[PDB]
Each structure stands twice: as C-alpha cells, then as structure tokens.
Amino acid sequence: DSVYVQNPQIPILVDRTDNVLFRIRIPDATKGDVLNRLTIRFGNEDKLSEVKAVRLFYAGTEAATKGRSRFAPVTYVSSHNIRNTRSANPSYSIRQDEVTTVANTLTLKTRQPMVKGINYFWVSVEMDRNTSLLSKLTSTVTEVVINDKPAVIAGEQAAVRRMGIGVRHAGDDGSASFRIPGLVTTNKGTLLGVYDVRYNNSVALQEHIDVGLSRSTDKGQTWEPMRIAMSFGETDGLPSGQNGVGDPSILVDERTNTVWVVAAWTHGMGNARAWTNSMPGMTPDETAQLMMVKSTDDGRTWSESTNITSQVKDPSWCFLLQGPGRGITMRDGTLVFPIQFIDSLRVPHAGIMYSKDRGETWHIHQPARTNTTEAQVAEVEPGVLMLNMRDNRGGSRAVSITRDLGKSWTEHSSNRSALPESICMASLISVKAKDNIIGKDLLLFSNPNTTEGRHHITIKASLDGGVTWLPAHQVLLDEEDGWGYSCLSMIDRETVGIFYESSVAHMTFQAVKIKDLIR
C-alpha cells in the first residue's frame, strides 16, 4: 500500500495518439497484487471537450541492477523510431483500460496480476487534433486501489501540463531525422520554421542534408506541408551525400517582409564531419560555402541560391558559417545574421554579418570572443547588439556588446555568469515595449537550463536588458532528454512561439503567454 506518481513536465502533442500524463511505480508488490482501479481528477477550469481519450498501460517490471527510483523501464513513446513516433510502442506497453468521454473524475481498471517487486503503469492522454496550443491540463492521481484497499500515494504530480505540436517527426517524408530549428514571424503574422532534413541518419554535414521549411498562417495550430527552401542535389555530378546544406538561420527583413535563409553548403568531404574537415580556400572544392535564398511571397516559394562566400570569408579560415537559428532587422533597417569561423589554427570564433542594402551585400568585421561557436544576436537598445554565444569552456553563455556592427566588442555584465549551458545552441530575441502586452522592453532566451546534457528546455525573460534573469520569469517546457536546439519568435502581442528539438518530437512548436513568463 505505497505507490509513487510522476506528472512529467513534457509537451502534450495535439497530433499524437499517446502522450505520457502520469508514470507510476509500485515498488514493493507481492506476486498476484492487482491495481483494481485508479482515479484521475482534472482542474475545474480544464477544457475536457478537447480530451479525446485517457488510457492506462502496464509496462511490466524493472531489471535487478537498475535501482528502485526510475518511473519507467524504457521510453514509452519514441521520438526517434521512423516506423512509429505517434503512439506507445505496443511491445513495451499493454492497454489495461480506456475512457473516450472524459469527466473531471475518471476511473481506470486492470485485472493484471503484478510480479514481486517493481511494477510500472502509466496514463496516456490523447487530445483532439484541433486542441488549442494555449490549453493547459491540471491532473492528479487522487486514488489507487490494490487488493480492494486504497494505497498511500506519493510523488510530485502538481505540474501544469502544456500542449505542443510535432511539426516534424523522425521518418516524416522519408527523412531519418530533422535538426537545427530556426523560427521567424513575417509582417503578415505567418510563422516560418527552418531545419536540416537529414535523410540518411542524424549526423551533421557532410551528408545528404537539405534545408526544409514549415509555414503556419494560424499561429501554429496548422503547418503547411514541408517546402525545401534550399538543396544542391547532384551538383557537378558529385553524390547528394557529398552536396549537403544545413545549420540554417532565417530572418525577416521587417522593412520589405522579404524572408532570408543562410546555410552552409559542403561539396565533397567524403562522409566525414565538416567541423574538422572543412579546409582553407574559397572554392566549393576547397571549403564550405555560405549560401542564401529569399522569399518575397511570405515564405511560400524560394529564390535559387546565391553564393556570398567571396564577400565575407577570409581565405585562411578553415570554415565560415551562419550561427543556426535566426537573424534580426535592427530599428535602422540593418539586416544581421550571427556567424562563426574556424581560423587557420582551428580556433572557433563567434561574430556577426550584416547588410545595409536589404541583403544585396554582406560584411563581417572582428570576432567577439575566442573559442565560441553558435551565437544569436538581439538589439537590446537602439544601435546596441548583444551577442549570446556557445562557449567551449563550458558551464555558461558568453555575452558581448557591439555599437559598431562588430568592429569593436565589450564584455556584458552577464558574461559567463547569468545563463547556465552544457555547450549547446541557445535562442535570444528582443521585444519592444510597444510590441507586447507587458508594455516593457523584454529579452527572451531559451536553451537547455543545465550545465550537463540536453534537457530542462526553459524560456527565460529579462526586464533589464539581460543583466538579470529572475527565476520567477521562467517557464520549464521539457524536463526530459533531447538534442537541445531551440528558436524563439513572438507570435503576436501576448504570446511567444518556440520551435525546438524536444523529448517528444525532432521539431516541436509550443506557444506561451507572456503573462505566464512575467508575473
């Protein structure tokens, strides 16, 4: 009569058959014990009309050497299995009960005789496909009955669960995986999400990789079928596997609504990683190429690729590429893409690349900091760019300031202190006071909020230009393991959108009210 319940803070996907609502460990069972019924209660203000079904599963027992504090023996719903990312793997979970009309109180039953020791059950919630992304479930296991005696319930299960949508699942359109998210909002309020389409596997360039794009005109409820924003197929009669293009960055020219996508095209390089194999020079045969496409129809169709390598790459650099995620338009109309280069001695540096002429020509000046890679840039005050950098030293984000488009750089007070990381891509955006419901300038940041691994994907807000990130002004979205990359874009005045690699899908979209972030 002692049962442990977890309510995991992971997204409930509106497009999934199964989502883990509760994991349950019964640690000290006698052979033949039966979980006769368990009762679930939903908060009074929950929209139960959007809940399609609730299922109780049994997942058997634990291995003798894996200890007694786990809530599962295995991943119940895979985000990697190309054959099934949408329902529980039936080989790990057997359905005991199912309810297809959901009330505020709900009872699930089993007749399953338990084995001696640890026994695992879990509750799946299925949502209607048209469920609001802003909907929230407050669910609690209130009663567990074993051998017709109510059992003592323990565990943190008070989580307020949020909805999301799997824009790209492993295997979609025959692609093994999707990685490296970028997100912008066009002047028409259209969401544009870019990513690597990694056809063969999940390894970085060099490989068969194109830049894909997902488009939504209804704030992420619906996503139009995947467009290929950029591709090099069998250029020069070299295999598509030696013509990959990826690590995309996307920005909206706020003056013209012209959408720009920059990416790294690797030509040759056998089947090895560009990071260690891209070499000095300028030609496609010599070094990775900086390539760009544009859309003048709000991201519906895409220009042929233009090669901008000659404009910005020093010949001595082993590798120049965009910082993955997004770029910005400044108040004065300057277009800015974060960049990174590996110098002649294999030392990586983060910096910025900008256009003054609507993207006709691009310029790079001085690197911001030694041994940095992926970076995102925000205009924190007029003419003042904040670069927020992945740092190979580990532990925390590097933060620098330029007032001269990266001719010179100043360390910010928050440098290597305020924002923990595990050496991973992070998103930073600025929101003007007049452009959001709070009526105050915001910085919004997202990354895996840990110094080890990639998990606890969190949106953080700053009211003081990134000097301070109060714990209260943070929302945890995904406490389980993923590939960690994310990108933020304001959807409207009241909600921020996050397009990220999650524990529940390769490309996950969630929408969060600013009023949830700030007070």
Next chain:
Amino acid sequence: DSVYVQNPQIPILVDRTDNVLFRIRIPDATKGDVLNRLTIRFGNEDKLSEVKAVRLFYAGTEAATKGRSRFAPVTYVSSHNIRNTRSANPSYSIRQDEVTTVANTLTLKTRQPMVKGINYFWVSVEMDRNTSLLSKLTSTVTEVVINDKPAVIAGEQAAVRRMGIGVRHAGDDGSASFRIPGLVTTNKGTLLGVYDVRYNNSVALQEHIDVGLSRSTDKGQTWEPMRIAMSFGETDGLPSGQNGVGDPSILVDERTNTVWVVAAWTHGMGNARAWTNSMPGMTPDETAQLMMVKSTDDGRTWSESTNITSQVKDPSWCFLLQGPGRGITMRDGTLVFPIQFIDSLRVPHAGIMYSKDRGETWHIHQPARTNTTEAQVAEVEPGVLMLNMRDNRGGSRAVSITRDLGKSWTEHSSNRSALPESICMASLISVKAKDNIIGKDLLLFSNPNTTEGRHHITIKASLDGGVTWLPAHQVLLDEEDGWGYSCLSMIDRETVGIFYESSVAHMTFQAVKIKDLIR
C-alpha cells in the same frame, strides 16, 4: 600517376540488385580529369550467362582528414538500412554506365569531371536470381583510361569471388535486425536456419525477440517464408518487450528426423541485458528459462514450448542457456546441445547438455573450463566429444575433450593455440569418412579469423581430428566487418553450407565444395 583497384573477398548475393565487384581509388587527379573507359576481363570458364548486369558508379572524393589508403568514403551497399539493403544508396553512388550483356571483355565509360585529389569509382555486379551458389567469378581490371591515356594499375585484385544468398536482410517482415544463426541438414536434405528476430533494434535479451526459421528443400537456392519457431508474446500480461526468447541452438535427431530448437526466454528484466540482469532462482520471474520446441514434419510446423529449466539448472546459477548455433546426434543416438551458465559469483562456464531418450529428459554434469561462454560440440571419434569454446581471456579458442558426457574434461593439444579468435561465437562440425567425397574424417570450423574485431569469416578443415589446421585447408568468405556469428552444416557428400552474419546480410548462406577446402 597510378590507379588502385581492390577485388574485395565478400559474398556476391544472387538476391541483391548491387554487389561490390571492384572498388577503385584515383588518388592524384587534376580537376577536370575524366575516366573515359575501364575494361574488365573474366576467366575463360566463368558462367557469364548468369551475370544480369555490370554498373560503374562514381562516389565523389574523400575527407581531408581520412588519409589516402581507403577504397571508399562510405558503405556503398548497406546491410543495416531497413529501407534499402538490396541496391546501392543512391545518395552515395551515381551510375555512370551499365552493360546488360556480359562478355569475357567488358568496357564501362563515364563523362564525369574528377575533383582535384582522391576520386572513388566502383563496379557493381547483379546476378540472375537463379544463379548457382557454387558459381565463381575470376575478374580483373585490365585497362583504365584517363584523358585518353591508359593509366598504370596497382593493387591485389586476384580474388576468386563466390556467390551467396541473403536469407534475412535488416527490415524484412518488419524486424529491425536478425542475429545468432543456427543451421542443420534434416534426413530429407532440408536446410533449417534459426535466428533471433530482433524487432525494435539489435540489442540482446531482454527485448522483443522471437526465434525465426528459414527452410530450403533445394540446398539454399530458395528459402520458404520465415516461420516463428518460438515466441512468448504477452505471457502473464507482461509486454512482448519483457518476453523475449533468443540465442537459439538447433539439432536434428538423426534417428527420428525430429528437429529440436532450444532458446533462452527472459520474462520481466525491464529493458536491460539478461547477461548482467538474470539472477539466481528457478521461476520465470526470477531467472532466464531454458525452453524447447520440436518439429516432426521436417521443420514445417513447431510444437508449443516445453520448459526444461527444472531438469538441468542449479538454483544458485544467475543464468543457464544453450550455446548458440547447433547441437548434434552422437553415433549411439545421444542428443547433445552445448550450454553455458553464470555461477553465483558471475563467472561464466561452457559445458554440454544431453538426452539419451530422444529428448524426453536432459542432463548437465561438470563445466569444461572457467571464464568460457559460447561453445559448439562435435563427436571427433566414437564416444569422444570435442567442446570448442569462446574464451574471455582473448586471442584463441579453448578446446577440451570428454568421453563421459562432461563428468570429466581433458585439455586438447589445440587448446588456446591453434584457432585465433576475437571473443566471438564459432561453429565446429564433424564429417565421417563414409559421409563425404574426400573419404576421410573431417573437422570443419568457422569464425572471424582475427584476434581483433569481427571480419575475415573463414571455413577451416582438419584431417587429424583438430590437432592441426593447415593454412592451405582454409577458404576466406568475408574480409569486411560484420557481427561475426556463423553455423556450418554439410548439405550433401560434396558441399558444406555456412549460415552466418556477414558484411552483406544479417543472415547469409553460402555453399563451398569440400574439394576447395582440401587440395
């Protein structure tokens, strides 16, 4: 400059679209160089009528960091990709030319401008599906033309190539992988091949694993659809992922033609490895179960499973299971399966389990040797069993003798000396003088012929009861990387069959003339 050719000693699969005949490295190319023409010559006695097509592919260049001695940048034809194991991955190889009528001289052409430095081409052979498994190609690249000047050819390319058949490819019947081959010949000359059907991935028990069986009544030219010899589905309401059965061993009762299959059923154990997680006791909830099925109709249908655990397992053992591969009938009608057990202190021991009553009851006496696992047994002389053991000490096979069914054991002269291994399953069989064309007692052995990795799958023959394995009495079948497990069975008086995990398919069958092994 020179051009390098390799003729890799790997099986040409009769059921494949593409097979690597030649790999070609042009190391010192000038940008724009064109391989105009390449001429292939076949031996005068080759059966070119069963060659369906020959293709020339281009696979681009090499990575800067991967040196200049490789014959490819990547696996051309995958044995793991569930979406395609039968043709070249089109993202790594572009077809230049194709010939569908093959003569003793053959010319392939390209117009492809080469990149500066290393350029890779390769020759694919496609065989008629009804190609004899005993057929051999003797092929050499005799001319390579670059910029209408013949180039200097170098490299070992004098291999005599052999045919094979992919009985099981990764992805077949929705299964991620197939592992752990066993092979017997029934009294009706029927080949029976058993293996793990590993549905979710390629990891060992505990997982969703069944024992599959492939049957051939024409010496391996054709294989009947996969039968499930053994399965535990959702026994006791535990998931199929916690009801795996695998590491199968198969023997023919030569007196009755009754076919027996023994396998390890793991019940519970979360999603962890049975090797470290099976614990002392006797019940399915406590420890791995030794389970058996039989076929009285030459392997067409299979009995329900019988639980043998209580007859032979010491309660203090963490784990008792069959040695994967095959068992034997002795001259006196005793049925013998090799076995292995992990004692109370986690020390593994190889031994034998036998029946004197046509498989009604089974008995285990003493272990042969400390820190041994997988073993195969042959009757080398009347009443004299040779156990050939995987040894955790590394470098070489353990070999012991019993003449009292393992009550007592003697080290053989060949022990830890004569047969190199990398710690891997190996096959051993005996052939009586009156049962084969040579008219002499044979021992035949197969394993990866190396002390490191799993490659150079080789059949070895001994004329002196395993005292000596002369280098001349050996056939190399697969010089490239695989999972290494194999099982031998005589097909008829003239040919040995090998069912093995190869570089070209999860379950590969080849047939070899004894007269190729011996002089």
